[PDB]
Design a binder for this molecule. Sequence first.
Ligand SMILES: [Ca+2]
Ligand SMILES: [Ca+2]
Length: 315
Amino acid sequence: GGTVKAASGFNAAEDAQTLRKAMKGLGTDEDAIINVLAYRSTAQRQEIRTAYKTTIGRDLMDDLKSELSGNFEQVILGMMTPTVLYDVQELRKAMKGAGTDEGCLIEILASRTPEEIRRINQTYQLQYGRSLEDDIRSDTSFMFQRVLVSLSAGGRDESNYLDDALMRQDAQDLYEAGEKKWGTDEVKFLTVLCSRNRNHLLHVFDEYKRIAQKDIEQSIKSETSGSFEDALLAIVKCMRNKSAYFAERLYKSMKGLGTDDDTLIRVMVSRAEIDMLDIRANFKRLYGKSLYSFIKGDTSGDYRKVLLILCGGDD
Ligand SMILES: [Ca+2]
Ligand SMILES: [Ca+2]
């Protein structure tokens, strides 16, 4: 499960007072801020925002924004945003720039369940006046656009039903699409990849290996390239092992000179109370080093401090 849990003996107004005292005056007590916000669940954080206003008379987000800066501010504000809205905002941000952050689009649209995808669509439209699909259509192109549009519909079957005839026809279709460099009959291979339930799909992947004598992932890496390749692979990885998918996003955001702070922040904030314990297990297995030591080595200051707390511990 997750690493961040709801605190016991919770008193929103006592917390509001603590935050105010940490920010009042010239400067800021970042550690007092961390010791409160990082040890509360998102729901509790929302209760602190409400109490701050009602008890302090101030808007908490405005103070956090004016008081903090940099990546630290980015992490903290991320932690303060209600869950569905955070995804909606990250999606919006990924599209509006000189160039789209296609990785963010894939990461979210591929790893979210049907119910989460439904909430995101409703909130996005409410918040921006247009549907997520319209913006995807506006900022992305070709086969990559088409894949994201399918995922955005969120129509994946949730039962565990297996139709044997269907499974064999399905692997056959993926095999043909692949033979055709995943370029024709987009509607056929997308239907399989996006609509079929997990159990059925996992079987389709096994039937595919027999038909192709090659794993689906190697076929994709071969017959495909660019963002379209990353999208297809993300779907396959999230169906097989989603937590291993996130461990890999985290690994690639820190591996090498520099860091992709945006990705590191979004994954740590968004998955902290969901499957961080699992992401950690797969990170260790896959990379031989714990997530903790990677973050610890790629970051510094308060930013790092709050990131390690979201990590939860060493492995
Ligand atoms: Ca201050
Ligand atoms: Ca690095």
